[PDB]
């Protein structure tokens, strides 16, 4: 009985934050170091693609691993 209202609460939270996720062509950085950035996001990025940071520095997406982009 309580599983239905817990499901309703988590579905309401997903419906609230689904506008704020917007992860298709944008990504947020997890790790920065030594000229390498692993970024959460960028679901549609290609392998060997020009990608651009917030301050205007370009980058090349080589590793398209599962939960981040190297």
């Amino acid at each position: 009985i309580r599983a239905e209202e817990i499901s309703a609460l988590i579905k309401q939270q997903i419906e609230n934050y689904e506008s704020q996720i917007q992860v298709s062509d944008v990504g947020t950085v997890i790790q920065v170091g030594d000229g390498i950035a692993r970024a959460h996001g960028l679901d549609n990025v290609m392998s060997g693609e020009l990608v651009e940071f917030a301050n205007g520095v370009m980058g090349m997406a080589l590793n398209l691993e599962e939960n981040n982009v190297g």
């Binding site: 309580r2 599983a3 209202e5 817990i6 499901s7 609460l9 988590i10 579905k11 939270q13 997903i14 934050y17 689904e18 704020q20 996720i21 947020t28 997890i30 959460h40 939960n67």
Partner: protein, 175 residues
């Protein structure tokens, strides 16, 4: 490598539920958490999102996972602080395995060409309860009509077959 860590966390929560004497409520709301996270899989991807801070995710759990008991909510927040929120359904399955080990309830899956009557299910439970050593036992029944005239019952990782492979056994023996 996730099931051993889920067994670790579930054994801790199981010892808490036994020392508080509230095993049934912890079992009930762990079943509720498992059903709620199996209903929607976007919640783990929401709580893996980096722009949400840790306190906001804790507020999401405290507002969303409400009505569950206090050790369950503390376990979920402890998993959130340790970046181990991906193994909450594994925690729920290992914890319900420990609860069914405590109560003596065994899980069995029977494959029969006809849907079995309830007296036959009670008879199978009374037969295999002495076989596996447990007090009582549960049967889940799926038809699977490729089977012809028999039952194929599986308790854990042991299969008790008497449905079709008698004919496969004899044609393997003739050839």
């Amino acid at each position: 490598n996730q099931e051993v860590i889920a067994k670790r966390y579930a054994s801790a929560l199981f010892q808490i539920a036994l020392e508080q004497g509230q095993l049934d409520r912890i079992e009930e709301d762990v079943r509720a958490v498992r059903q709620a996270l199996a209903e929607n899989g976007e919640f783990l991807s929401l709580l893996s999102y980096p722009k949400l801070s840790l306190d906001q995710k804790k507020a999401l759990i405290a507002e969303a996972f409400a009505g569950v008991s206090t050790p369950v909510q503390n376990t979920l927040l402890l998993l959130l602080e340790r970046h181990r929120f991906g193994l909450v359904p594994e925690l729920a399955e290992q914890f319900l395995a420990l609860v069914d080990d405590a109560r003596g309830i065994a899980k069995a899956v029977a494959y029969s060409a006809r849907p079995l009557t309830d007296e036959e299910l009670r008879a199978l439970s009374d037969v295999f309860a002495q076989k596996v050593g447990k007090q009582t036992l549960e049967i889940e029944n799926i038809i699977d009509p490729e089977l012809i005239g028999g039952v194929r019952l599986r308790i854990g990782n042991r299969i008790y077959d008497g449905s079709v492979s008698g004919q496969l056994e004899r044609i393997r023996r003739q050839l």
